[PDB]
């Protein structure tokens, strides 16, 4: 199995591409870290991530507590004797709320919408990105994954979604750029938009799981570090 | 006197960028208030705005802390009969943070220094600016200044300050698309860094003030809207 061995933590995974991200990543055999507020959602997701191969531990994370991205990273350095081979930063968190706000403004919506969105989907990124780098760094090589989309670029759905976008495509080229010389690869992963709404999902999913599978056994992997990847970029790639 | 009768706010007006701001507006003529955590300090500041011109009022306000932004705006509203012209979105929280830590990685680092840099200087501008659109958007007019600079583009000094930034410059072009269909302006300067350290800055901060009571004076305004604007290039506009 090509992951055989490896260690992985996915941010996000009850659901979405969070979820189809660990079930790839298990399914390559990999040993797969998967974090939400809510243990009982995770178990579901892990018997059915563990069924596909490797294995899947589930750990109630909030990650807009530091404190507990803290106890997270612990436990894998804990259990895994200090391998970590793969972080997705993932985040489904506040896209309800996106939802359910369309078409009002950021003044017309309540200033706290910002906490919503960019706590746990950036706030937690940061998080997570320190902790685990901490692991890789001194291993020599490893890969965080932000997931993001081109509301980076540009105007999409709210305010605080595409600022949160900009700033996560800045924190995966930054992290990158630091990482280089410890042969750390960090890259911005454009999954598309699980929730159409917004804008098949299933299928979406899927992809961006075989997408970071592939990106996690490319030898090399470090000469897309800090770019942006669409995944069906990366499918035609791979 | 070129802004009588115009009502401003500056936030991180206790020194550098946000001091020489207010100090510019007030000799223009505006009323401008004034934040940050200290009285005292805040004191000291007014005493010289209001001896330039106009009024500078002191109001004491983490921005951090989303109820103390709406009491501020609250202030504002009431002292005010509804008027806000100009808000400038302003922070030096954190810049100390990164001079201490320079050359020390993301992972070397506390997590927490996220919270130093991008808490007050990326939270807090959102918080003000959602509190300060309700106030212009009513008007059909009204400037939004976002200070930020090249670091939106590329690494900067460290992670959270470059990936602040980035954040900083999406938020004035996101907020300046919604806004502008009623009017209100906003966009992004780049002042140049007073910290050179970092890297005259009395000058520089003098300078920084110009170009915002000229922004705020321009009929042409909105035509700048969602702009980044680099300070010695209003200079020559100007």
């Keep these: 199995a090509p992951m055989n061995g490896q260690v992985c933590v996915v941010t996000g995974a009850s659901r979405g591409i969070g979820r189809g991200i660990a079930l790839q990543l298990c399914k390559a055999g990999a040993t797969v870290y998967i974090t939400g507020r809510h243990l009982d959602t995770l178990r579901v997701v892990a018997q059915e991530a563990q069924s596909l191969g490797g294995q899947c531990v589930p750990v109630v994370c909030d990650s807009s507590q530091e404190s507990e991205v803290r106890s997270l990273f612990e436990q894998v350095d804990r259990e895994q004797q200090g391998r970590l081979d793969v972080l997705v930063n993932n985040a489904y968190a506040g896209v309800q709320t996106i939802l359910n706000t369309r078409n009002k403004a950021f003044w017309e919506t309540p200033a706290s919408m910002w906490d919503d969105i960019n706590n746990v989907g950036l ?115 791979y």
Tied chains: 1, 2.
């Design 123 to 237: 706030r937690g990124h940061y998080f997570c990105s320190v902790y685990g780098a901490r692991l890789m760094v001194p291993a020599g090589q490893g890969l965080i994954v932000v997931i993001s989309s081109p509301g980076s670029l540009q105007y999409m759905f709210n305010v605080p979604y595409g600022v949160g976008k900009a700033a996560c495509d800045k924190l995966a080229a930054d992290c990158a750029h630091e990482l280089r010389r410890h042969g750390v690869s960090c890259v911005s992963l454009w999954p598309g938009i699980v929730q159409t709404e917004l804008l098949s999902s299933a299928e979406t999913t899927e992809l961006s799981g075989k997408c970071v599978v592939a990106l996690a056994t490319d030898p090399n992997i470090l000469s897309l570090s800090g770019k942006v990847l669409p995944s069906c970029d990366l499918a035609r790639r």
